[PDB]
Amino acid sequence: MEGIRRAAQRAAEEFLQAFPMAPGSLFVLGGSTSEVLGERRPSLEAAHAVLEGLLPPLLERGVHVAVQACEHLNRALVVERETARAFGKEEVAVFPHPKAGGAKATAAFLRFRDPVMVESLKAQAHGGMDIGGVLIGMHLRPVAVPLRLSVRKIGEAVLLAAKTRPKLVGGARAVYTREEMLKKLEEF
Amino acid sequence: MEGIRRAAQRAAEEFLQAFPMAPGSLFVLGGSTSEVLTRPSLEAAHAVLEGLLPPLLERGVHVAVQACEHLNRALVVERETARAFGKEEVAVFPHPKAGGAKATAAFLRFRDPVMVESLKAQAHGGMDIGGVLIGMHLRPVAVPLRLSVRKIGEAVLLAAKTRPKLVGGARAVYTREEMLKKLEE
Amino acid sequence: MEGIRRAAQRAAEEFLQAFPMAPGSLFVLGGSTSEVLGTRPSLEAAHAVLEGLLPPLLERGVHVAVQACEHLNRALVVERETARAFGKEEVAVFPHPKAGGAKATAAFLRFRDPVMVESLKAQAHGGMDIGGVLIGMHLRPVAVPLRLSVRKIGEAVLLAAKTRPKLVGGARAVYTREEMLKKLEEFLP
Ligand SMILES: [Zn+2]
Ligand SMILES: [Zn+2]
């Protein structure tokens, strides 16, 4: 599953290269292991390979990671106790398993230190990835911006990565860069 | 009056046995001294507080005391509690005939008390002495606790803790074991 | 111009006298420099207003937000540390006089690490509105207008407001520690 493992690390590095997530920000991972393995039921092997490759890069930058479980658990997420506390998350009571929750949330639950399940992130993630068309947008804060990365797939699953950036505001006379602001000042 | 305190201490004792509230959590007390004895009693308020407060405070649990409905159930908390929990302070001073004896006894005993609008449903547990209701202050899901002490004085005691919502459909599981058993398959 | 900074300085001192804001509190400034002048904006008039109002607030550890005009949806300039302390949402834009006003632009130029934020989520404890631009949307309940001796800044009318807790309770309630102790006598032996 090395390529799953390898492709995972790559995307995480590419992502952070394009979106240098600061310490304390929050990252959300959603994905389907059945999709990662294609048409050949979930896979724990694949699950651990994805995490194996994806998590270190983010953890090294002190970025908090959340792993969304599937719809049978309402998409509650596996997070470290400290992340729930740092982000004011509401804990919900359930324990994931491949058949009820999925292999990726289950493997995350086993690999974390003091995992807890949370109802949602209250849409506070700053960036994240969707592996396999499971959807992760509900977890991201405005404004989500899809990121085209060179790594287009993790196994056979289509990879969708998104960063977030602030809303663009103000009317026809407004500007959006410091450079343009300075020109309006010279003109003034 | 010492018996009211003794029932209060046994209640607090049983309550924390079943729900060992951690440092930093919030307990809400609501109650009517009139029901413990329609005239409030500061004496009865002192006994209930002496019985309830020490075991909570020694655990680092924050305490809120709900005033009656004439002050719209605004509660008494230490200024630090209002700060840790992002509570909104309102302007009023309680007295037994408008606030009730217990909010009054708390306001006088607290180091730096403020009246707050509500706790924004943040409490992890509490007690209702006399059926005055405290549910609106508790975070989901409130689980009432059976304690041997069913009354304080002549007032019924309702005690409750809180716990996370149970979620997931028919295949979901709820204990680490059940999970393992599921992995082994 | 010095006349404008002096009226700003008097406004400030008097305001903080009537409402001694604590460190960590939040003050909101809104205004039209064109109104101060008595048309187009002026960075000089902005400069005079900020030099008069900001040193006394900052020395008390009060966080300051400066409201841009409606072309920028009244987003506000605040230090990044303030956006963070008050859980504010950063918005993407750069004010300039013609779009945002001179006051907000001067704040942005002067702050150390400025960011624009969408609103203050009505968390401000007090502020000033110079010229009738409105700042009430930024104040937490209950806003209380203060009458300062300083009524204008330049030609702009000055409106200053503090905030205080909602007064609650029915007919039997009391509102001072004094009234409370008296009510307790009457109950106690
Ligand atoms: Zn100057
Ligand atoms: Zn200066």
Other Cβ atoms closer than 10 A to C144? 13
A126 three-class SS? coil
With helix as H, strand as E and coil as C, how does chain B read? Answer: CHHHHHHHHHHHHHHHHHCCCCCCCEEEEEECHHHHCCCCCHHHHHHHHHHHHHHHHCCCCEEEEECCHHHCCCEEEEHHHHHHHCCCEEECECECCEECHHHHHHHHHCCCEEEECCCCCCECEEEEECCCCCHHHECCCEEEECCCCCEECCEEEEEEEECCEECCCCCCECCHHHHHHHHCC
| Both structure tokens of A82 | 């400290």
To the nearest whole Å, the CA of A92 is away from the closest chain B CA by 5
Position B7, amino acid: A
Displacement of CA B126 from its chain's centroid (Å):
2
To the nearest whole Å, the CA of B177 is away from the closest chain A CA by 9
Other Cβ atoms closer than 10 A to B91? 17
To the nearest whole Å, the CA of C122 is away from the closest chain B CA by 13
Backbone angles phi and psi of B158, in degrees to 5: -110, 120
* Interfacial A residues in 152-171 facing C (CB < 8 Å): 165-171
Question: Any CB–CB contact under 8 A between C75 and chain A?
Answer: yes
Using the mean position of ligand 1's atoms as its centre, give its distance from the Cα of residue C48 in Å: 6
Neighbours of chain C (3+ CB pairs under 8 A): A, B
Write the burial class of residue C170 (CB in 10 Å: 0-12 exposed, 13-18 middle, 19+ buried): exposed
Other Cβ atoms closer than 10 A to B178? 12
Subunit contact A106:B183, Cβ cutoff 8 A: yes
| Both structure tokens of B54 | 């020490």
* Interfacial B residues in 7-36 facing C (CB < 8 Å): none
Q: Which residues of A touch B172 (CB under 8 A)?
A: 72-73, 94, 100-101
| Dihedral sign computed on CA atoms, order B172, B176, B180, B181 | negative
Q: What is the resolution of this structure in A?
A: 2.2
| Dihedral sign computed on CA atoms, order B163, B164, B165, B166 | negative
Subunit contact C187:B40, Cβ cutoff 8 A: yes
Candidate from B172, B179, B182 with C-beta closest to A73: B172
User: What is the Cα–Cα distance from A179 to B93, expressed in whole angstroms?
Assistant: 56
Under 8 Å between Cβ of C29 and C70: no
Name which of B29, B19, B21, B54 is nearest B119 in CA terms.
B29
Residue holding tokens 């947008």?
A137
CA distances from B88 to A50, A74, A130, B65, C183 (A): 45, 33, 40, 15, 25
| Both structure tokens of A107 | 């493997």
- Best of A78, A79, A94, A106 to substitute, by most chain B Cβ atoms within 10 angstroms, is A94
A80 three-class SS? strand
Listed in sequence order, the residues at least 6 apart from A84 whose beta carbon sits closer than 8 Å to its beta carbon are A90, A91, A116, A118
Q: Which residues of A touch C85 (CB under 8 A)?
A: none
Number of domains in chain C: 1
The approach used to solve this structure was X-ray
Terminal C-alpha separation, chain A: 61
Candidate from B74, B92, B97 with C-beta closest to C183: B97
Under 8 Å between Cβ of B171 and A106: no
Which CATH number fits the domain that encloses residue A147? 3.40.50.10360
Residue holding tokens 């398959």?
B185
Structural domain boundaries enclosing A35: 1-188
Subunit contact B173:A91, Cβ cutoff 8 A: no
Using the mean position of ligand 2's atoms as its centre, give its distance from the Cα of residue C51 in Å: 5
Q: Which residues pair with C117 in a beta bridge?
A: C76, C90
- Best of C25, C125, C142, C168 to substitute, by most chain B Cβ atoms within 10 angstroms, is C168
